[PDB]
Amino acid sequence: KEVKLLLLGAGESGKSTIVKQMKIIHEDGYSEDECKQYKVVVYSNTIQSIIAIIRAMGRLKIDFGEAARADDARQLFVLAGSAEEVMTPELAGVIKRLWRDGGVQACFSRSREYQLNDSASYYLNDLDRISQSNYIPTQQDVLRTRVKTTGIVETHFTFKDLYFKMFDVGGQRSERKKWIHCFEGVTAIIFCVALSDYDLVLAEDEEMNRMHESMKLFDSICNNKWFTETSIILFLNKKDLFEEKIKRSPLTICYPEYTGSNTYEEAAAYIQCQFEDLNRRKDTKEIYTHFTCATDTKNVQFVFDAVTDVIIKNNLK
Amino acid sequence: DFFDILVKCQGSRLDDQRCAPP
Ligand SMILES: Nc1nc2c(ncn2[C@@H]2O[C@H](COP(=O)(O)OP(=O)(O)O)[C@@H](O)[C@H]2O)c(=O)[nH]1
Known part of the structure; x- marks a missing residue:
């Protein structure tokens, strides 16, 4: 059977990096x-x-x-x-x-x-x-x-006796056809989030900080009626930079209503909670969260392995 | 509505600090 994986998430969230990593792990590499x-x-x-x-x-x-x-x-x-x-x-x-x-x-x-x-x-x-x-x-x-990147990034591979086609879309609606077919018949969606962007200063061309943007996008995706049968996978990427940053710059920057302490663990928990809470179909649809560092080949290998097993288990029912 | 959100939040990819493919 074939598996259509779709990478989504704002720019600078590690999607292309995830793809390269896939090329390294399940293909010969570079x-x-x-x-x-x-x-x-x-x-x-x-x-x-x-x-x-x-x-x-x-x-x-x-x-x-x-x-x-x-x-x-x-x-x-x-x-x-x-x-x-x-x-x-x-x-x-x-x-x-x-x-x-x-x-x-x-x-x-x-x-x-x-x-x-x-x-x-x-x-x-x-x-x-x-x-x-x-x-x-x-x-x-x-x-x-x-x-x-100008077009649509694609990579395919065979793993655990399964045929994976993985798509990174980017932004060019210069291609308005096949582009949409990337959203057709998807097995699972992988939303990437740069945690380290919690403390980023509000640019003059933004109406809300980058994190809340990622949140809004996620809200639009999860509760979209077209992905009811699609497994949703959340990658809170750039966890390393997050851990380094969180010692100094408080989360209050990103969420002023945050009362908890500034430990990596508690903070990350608050973020994950914030994203997961947007699912207005909590019963029917569950969200598969992971904390990733796309530059760590090993970590990506493990995470992706686990995701694959999840998909197989979902396939046996 | 979904697509205009998709693009409203995406493309901010820093195309400077980024070079052309081989
Ligand atoms: N230190 C660190 N850097 C990362 C991580 N994930 C991505 N990056 C870097 O962030 C940069 C931009 O990521 P990119 O692949 O363009 O994400 P994309 O915009 O969604 O395609 C890349 O050059 C990566 O090296 C991470 O977990 N840790």
């Missing part, structure tokens, strides 16, 4: 040729990240430690296309010096007040490793790659 191909992509993402932090330093008015580093920035924008083919030791030197600066790190520590991708620090901390001329990207490096 070969050395492909790994070689993604090099330029890695360099690019690294650069775009550090640049983004730099431009972000402006709007917040954040002064450097030692002023000299300023010159590097000027040089940076010129060398920004120098990696479009291999990183110059001069360029890698620039990035190193910049990432070493304390003010830049203060901005990075204040990354909630703007928009910084979550694959930044990964690439920036492992700079020395990738700035070598003979560098070949690891599978984990490829996992953290950020690729602009």
Whole structure:
């Protein structure tokens, strides 16, 4: 029998990352040729990240430690296309010096007040490793790659004697046909949520914080009369970043009515509760919640295994 | 109504800090 899996959830919730992970686990994974191909992509993402932090330093008015580093920035924008083919030791030197600066790190520590991708620090901390001329990207490096998507992402595989077709939709209604067929005859829906976005500052183009957006979307999905026969699976992803953040920034930011303590456990419980509470068919429809970290291949392997077993058990009735 | 919600909340994917596929 065939299984149609549909990944939904806001941007930056780990869907593409989940897909890549699937390619690693149940398929052969990424070969050395492909790994070689993604090099330029890695360099690019690294650069775009550090640049983004730099431009972000402006709007917040954040002064450097030692002023000299300023010159590097000027040089940076010129060398920004120098990696479009291999990183110059001069360029890698620039990035190193910049990432070493304390003010830049203060901005990075204040990354909630703007928009910084979550694959930044990964690439920036492992700079020395990738700035070598003979560098070949690891599978984990490829996992953290950020690729602009234009169409519908699809991947298929065989596992536990079952045929899985998994769809990531994205946003392009440039394709208005097949796009919709991705919502047709779905076995189960996997809604992804970035927990770490609880403390994000309200952008000027938002009417409600990102978490409440994810909530509204979920509300619209669960209680949609078209998925009555569809199993709903919730991935509260980015649990690691959540755990790190929750020590310092309170949940009251996201939910002002929250009375509990700021322990990871109790907080996460409150979030999960908040999402699950939106199901206006609690009797008929149950929701399958998991706390994931899509960058941890092992974790994803286990979670997906368990989900699969759930589906099989549902198939025997 | 569902679809306009879908798009009203999705596409904010940070297309900068993101490069073109190989
Ligand atoms: N540290 C950490 N990073 C994550 C996690 N999940 C996703 N990311 C990162 O978040 C970035 C954006 O995720 P993405 O795949 O674009 O999610 P999508 O927008 O739904 O497709 C990726 O570069 C991932 O490396 C997580 O659990 N922990």
